[PDB]
DNA sequence: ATTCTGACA
DNA sequence: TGTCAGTA
């Protein structure tokens, strides 16, 4: 689809995404550390984040606010990527 | 589908359980009172689990397993509950 | 013997 | 969660 193209389009910089998300710099590197999402690079070696990872960004805040750990977040986003 | 109501039959008690799933009274009563699991009662207020519970409580020992806590059980037995 | 609820040297 | 307690 034409769609997820477009969702995983890298554009978004690390700046709007944590006004956004309300994540820090650290805890977004951390996720990415995790498998969790997979921001590209610019020239600059700035990350570029797609629609589906500030998306998933935005559910791991959301998460977090419930309570839910790591172990939990990464079930979740994994059988959220097989439905 | 008789197969359903058999599923849904009181039949063993938290002894014979922790033998099936390999987990401990404590942890099986846990679960309990986060509403992972509704075990029917006896007259004696004693647990009787059915073939059901048994099995969303395999599930549990799964995730248990997997490191994931309340919070994150009760968000995925959440969805994995309305979406069949 | 077996399970139950509450509690923490 | 383990576990000891005092029952039912």
Do not use: C, W
Request: charge should be neutral; glycine fraction near 6%.
């Amino acid at each position: 689809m034409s769609d997820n193209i477009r969702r995983s389009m890298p554009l978004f910089p690390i700046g709007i995404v944590m006004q956004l998300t309300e994540l820090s710099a650290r805890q977004i590197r951390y996720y990415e550390e995790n498998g969790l999402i997979f921001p590209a690079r610019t020239e600059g070696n700035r990350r570029l984040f797609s629609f589906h990872d500030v998306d998933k960004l935005l559910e791991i805040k959301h998460l977090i606010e419930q309570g839910v750990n790591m172990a939990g977040i990464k079930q979740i986003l994994a059988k959220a990527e097989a439905e």
